Design a protein around this ligand. Structure first.
Ligand SMILES: OC[C@H]1O[C@H](O[C@H]2[C@H](O)[C@@H](O)[C@@H](O[C@H]3[C@H](O)[C@@H](O)[C@@H](O[C@H]4[C@H](O)[C@@H](O)[C@@H](O)O[C@@H]4CO)O[C@@H]3CO)O[C@@H]2CO)[C@H](O)[C@@H](O)[C@@H]1O
Ligand code: CA
Ligand code: CA
Length: 418
């Protein structure tokens, strides 16, 4: 497991990770207080499946609750009140056990951290930050969803729970928790939540301070139309917006450019996510995914959130694409372990590894066929990927001797290796 920084110092840990999103939105409801036992038990399995890292849920206990009609949620970790690890996922003891098992099996553990806000109103919690000291966004004048003097990023909904992450004392508190996660909970890196909520640069500071050489990924879900009109980003592509963030945080970023094309364009347009970028400095920072706990469904209640779900008719094509292309791929727990795509995903992980495809591998798209047709230059082998295409044989688009590596869904999914 190669573990360097990119040529631009971005913390992509070698550029060869394959990540599992270690949870779905309803886990706290479906397997209450049992999740860490489940992962401990599945540890060997996850490692054998080919994952090099697991994105764990928020470790900080969350006992929040909300309801707006038919819809209810809370306790998933995004509205935590303390750094106490005895939450809805299991005990501190179980977490440690789980992190130990995972790590033992060779799987790095990446924790989801939420620095933007906290469950301010939670009556019983270990962290109490008073009003009037500049600890809160609302300690300042808060016009709208724009940076105020107490918060250099957007706010979460109303902004009444937003922290001044830049206050020396707030910064220092997070800093110390990141170091703790690394030293006692085996953190190999972090997934930075709601990154639009605070400065990019703070993330670099935090990584530098606590886990300089670890892996990090930022979740920036904010489209061009969410920036002010005078902002260059109001008129930029989704790619530019996320790339800009990554340049400043010095961390890989979720490929929302790819996700938006998967949702709104045709398969041929998939070549427009960050990961298809002709500049390696651009595509190597992309962290690709098909669905996450927000965008996709989850077993159980209300089908989870499904804010921007990829239809089942494209799931195999979507996985085939991310698993065989540049950037760092992420697999959603549910597709892997609940819905039966596991076998299919397993095969693709093996193709990816056999080919030596990494974050900066070159990708070329071919214009004369239907669907998406790409040539990927893995370090070990060349891959020909034809999704929902009329392509006849790999030789129509690439030089070399190819063997069929994958052929699924009545040929809608075909991958050949050199
Ligand atoms: O005190 C502040 C605010 O509190 C109240 O907000 C509620 C929301 O109405 C609920 O919808 C909910 O919010 C969830 C959100 O629904 C859910 O998607 C999740 O969001 C994450 C997301 O998973 C993640 O990927 C990331 O990028 O960012 C999001 C934020 O971290 O988690 C949210 C928190 O549970 O719960 C909150 C708080 O209970 C109130 O209604 C507001 O007026 C108020 O300002
Ligand atoms: Ca690595
Ligand atoms: Ca904020």
């Amino acid at each position: 497991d190669q573990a360097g920084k990119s040529p631009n110092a971005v913390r992509y840990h070698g550029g060869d990770e394959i990540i599992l999103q270690g949870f779905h939105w309803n886990v706290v409801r479906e397997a209450p207080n049992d999740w860490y036992n489940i992962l401990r038990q599945q540890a060997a399995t996850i490692a054998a499946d080919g994952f090099s890292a697991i994105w764990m849920p928020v470790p900080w206990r969350d006992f929040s609750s909300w309801s707006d009609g038919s819809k209810s949620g809370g306790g998933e970790g995004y509205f935590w009140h303390d750094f106490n690890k005895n939450g809805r996922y299991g005990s501190d003891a179980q977490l440690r056990q789980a992190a130990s098992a995972l790590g033992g099996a060779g799987v790095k553990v990446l924790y989801d951290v939420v620095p933007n806000h906290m469950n301010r109103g939670y009556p019983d919690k270990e962290i109490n930050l008073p009003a009037g000291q500049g600890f809160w966004r609302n300690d300042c004048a808060d016009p709208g969803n724009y940076p105020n003097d107490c918060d250099d990023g957007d706010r979460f909904i109303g902004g009444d729970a937003d922290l001044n992450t830049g206050h020396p004392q707030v910064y220092g508190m997070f800093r110390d928790e990141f170091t703790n996660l690394r030293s006692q909970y085996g953190a190999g890196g972090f997934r930075f939540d709601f990154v639009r909520g605070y400065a990019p640069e703070r993330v670099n500071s935090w990584m530098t301070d606590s886990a300089d050489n670890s892996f990090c990924v930022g979740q920036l879900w904010k489209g061009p139309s969410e920036y002010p009109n005078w902002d260059w980003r109001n008129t930029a592509s989704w790619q530019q917006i996320i790339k800009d963030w990554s340049d400043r945080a010095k961390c890989p970023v979720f490929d929302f450019a790819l996700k938006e094309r998967m949702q709104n364009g045709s398969i041929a347009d998939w070549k427009h996510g960050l990961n298809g970028n002709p500049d390696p400095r651009w595509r190597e920072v992309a962290v690709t995914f098909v669905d996450n706990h927000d965008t996709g469904y989850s077993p159980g209640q209300n089908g989870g959130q499904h804010h921007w779900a990829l239809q089942d008719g494209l799931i195999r094509q979507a996985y085939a694409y991310i698993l065989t292309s540049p950037g760092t791929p992420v697999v959603y727990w549910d597709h892997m372990y609940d819905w039966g795509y596991g076998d299919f995903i397993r095969q693709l992980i093996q193709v990816r590894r056999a080919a030596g495809v990494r974050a900066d591998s070159a990708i070329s798209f071919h214009s004369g066929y239907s669907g998406l047709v790409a040539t990927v230059s893995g370090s070990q082998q060349t891959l020909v990927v034809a999704l929902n295409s009329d392509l006849g044989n790999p030789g129509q688009v690439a030089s070399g001797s190819f063997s069929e590596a994958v052929n699924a869904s009545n040929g809608q999914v075909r991958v050949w290796r050199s």
